[model samples]
Target: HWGYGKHNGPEHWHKDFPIAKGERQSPVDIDTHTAKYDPSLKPLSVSYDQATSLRILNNGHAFNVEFDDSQDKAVLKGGPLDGTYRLIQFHFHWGSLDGQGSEHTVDKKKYAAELHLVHWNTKYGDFGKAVQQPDGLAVLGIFLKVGSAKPGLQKVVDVLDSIKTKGKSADFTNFDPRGLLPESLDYWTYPGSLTTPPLLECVTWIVLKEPISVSSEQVLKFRKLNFNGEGEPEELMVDNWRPAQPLKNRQIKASFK
Candidate 1:
């Protein structure tokens, strides 16, 4: 929703919500000191059937992957999970035009886009109700930069055409989503917040240290999103990225050596 005079307006963000001040605090410049940090995260379990019928939605703001956990193929603990959690939604946060899309401000810079794999604890029943709980959320934050085209991300590009029409969703099924993730799954974990509206400060963040690359063309598409109002034209949300905030005595532990 990066457009002129619309609901997704960026210029009006700092105005409409004063908390945008605190919320805008993100984009943490990632700096890994060691070359060999290993979290050795387990491979998520999924049967061929579960992967084939995976549900994907554009949701106007970002793309969402709604996996059917209720189905037999979608096993939780059987999938090498640390705990019982259902794969719920997957969305993205980019800059006004994808200039600096990263949500966590690094030591001082930002990236093109940040994709979040949002999941919820099954103890709270379904994902819809779990998101409201204190310990119900687990977010995997991955960084994106506009560089040479990476084939690993081509699957996402194929669906871009379908979601090109703002808010118009397409059921993207049978896509191998594992490719979208960087080779490095080991991450830096710590307590953090929503980084968005209501700025809920309850999430235990898992910010991946490794970076992924995508084409500039794909980055441009995010900038061309429909903002709001029928007459409003498209605008760039490239700089929609929020800057980093103080660690505030919070301890950030990374599995990476």
Candidate 2:
């Protein structure tokens, strides 16, 4: 229901999407000092069947690697969760330059980009229905740093050429989402909403402590995507991230010390 333009962007989302002013919003600053170490939280259980990757598409918002989640082919369990959550899609948010675009910041420090792996709680059925419930989604947030190129993402970056234009896509198979994660699964968890509108307060945010590596060259290719469609003016798709919202009274929990 919103775009990153001046009048229609986040600052004005509340006009049409009331939840933009909701108490438990996401992309909050992860202040480590107040983050409590919770021994009760289990280590994240991520299971992805590489063959389940269906295709990749550019929805004008971001390029998504959609998965065949008709069943529990790939799902997440444990780590601040009550039940199984199936992987729906994965996408990225970046800026015009390095060291800038991520949605969730670390003590006011933004990374080069942010990766969101969106999954919905199976108890609520499919993603469309599940997305509206209170405990309906689990979002894994991986921060992308500008460093040596990561081979894991090369396959994903390779297909970007064909799908460079909006409303474009291609068949992408045998790809596992785990390849994008860092060695350390250590993360901070909190209840929050989707950074994008309707800004539904359903996501259980899991922000990893370790940032993944991606070369400046790889990031340059990502910036080549444009937000405009077939006949629209070409607007570079960089900086497509939502700013951090108020934390309110939520508590940030950690899976490791």
Candidate 3:
């Protein structure tokens, strides 16, 4: 039962999941100065089907919007990836306040929130199987800043009331995920792991350089969701982001100079 609380937060995750201290953990600080401009990195190709969205749920850790990944209906290719990867689900991590929430930071500067578009290698058949292989998963990370409201983000915030408590879920359909992306796909990529428990070291993280906009009001909506179950003591689902991990021996390559 790992969480963001002091008793069982990331500091204690290594007690149960040893890989939490592994060499290539995720959500690392992107030191822009040190990020090498790699000319060989190809442009990222992402095609998402609006109808692929299934449902949204409050899994206690964070609310995730699951998608139907049965085929190549929504796929991500190129940009350091070997083959096609299927978009499985997307979720967010945020702080209790606007100043600091994003898991990955740029030059140690934090944003209001972070969105992870989780994908799995299609060659592995499914997400479960893909999670076990070294090159099985690819996660696209986007930063969210508080400013003008993002219409695409509003669709998700509007449904927060329906899923107030942990374990609660509601139908979320016909949502175009591309609308959530920033104008430029310029990114810094590296070998990394899942930010949460099990902390699997199988993700190729592609973090975009530019951040998308969301209003302060819209971000507050996320805090309204409860971390506890229906009857348990109410706990606000805030500060759900894990702090940046060590970069170790890995090199982060940028698609832009």
Candidate 4:
């Protein structure tokens, strides 16, 4: 149930959902080799409310961390970013858990597990209404491939021990997620839809071409998740992602070229 199959394929999701009906579904092909290189658009420096805290949630199928956004004190701006955007929620998509991890790839090489830093267009004036506008969303994509070395991801990884049984809860205080961002933020951006339901295509998918590596061990722990409810003792489930959809003539821009 993690990788791809019946009742699990992206096409199977109710076509009635607006976003799902779109042509471009991310985790697609990006050839760094053929990419036109540009250095100015790459992110050089970024800073935020260092004290911002994180509340980690094990939402059964995957893990999501909510932040204290009541203050409007948090912002993710880079580029050389065209402009800065606000932080919303950061989460992941996986295959059978972390070992295989999750990030729907276009071909074989460009695909890897992805960490999405969801941010909405604060310009919209309200969170509820932002989804209504196409430019109202921005997401930073961090590619995760399996590896060994214990990454600083250990901070997030430490919580795994507590949620070991699933549907588990943990107080993940004082963790600034920006620390997990890939060093280089030069990205490929396109008007694309959310990988999940309501499939809103309002986001500017800023997928970083250079993938960041996380300790393969940390990922293994991530792969153990199933949709059988947050409670553990569930069966092995691997199909946690939707398949890649066509770009359908959409223009995908990149900081590289």
> Which ten-residue region of model 3 has the weakest summed lDDT?
42-51
Q: For each candidate, what TM-score against the reference?
A: 0.73, 0.97, 0.98, 0.81
Number of the predicted model whose lDDT against the real structure is largest? 3
Backbone clash count for every predicted candidate, in the order shown: 31, 1, 0, 21
Candidate 1 lDDT over residue span 1-257, tens digit each: 23223465544555654544553233344555522343554543332235443655554455566665673343333222356655555667777544566877555467788887665667777765765766665667888888877675666666765654445667766665566677776566665666655445445466776778888887776665543323446433345444566554545556645
What is residue 210's positional error in candidate 3, in angstroms? 0.5
Question: What tens-digit string does per-residue lDDT give for candidate 3 at 8-42?
Answer: 99999999999999999988999999999999988
- As a TM-score, model 2 comes out at 0.97
Highest TM-score model number: 3
Collision count of model 2: 1
Query: Mind giving the per-residue lDDT tens digits that candidate 2 earns over 127-177?
Result: 888888989999999999999998899999988988877899899988877
Number of the candidate with higher TM-score, 1 or 2: 2
Q: Between the candidate structures 1 and 3, which one is better when assessed by TM-score?
A: 3
Reference-based lDDT, each prediction:
0.58, 0.90, 0.94, 0.63
- Model 4 misplaced regions, further than 4 Å: 1-5, 16-18, 31-46, 49-51, 78-84, 97-101, 104-107, 110-112, 164-168, 230-233
The worst-scoring run of ten residues by lDDT in candidate 1 lies at: 72-81
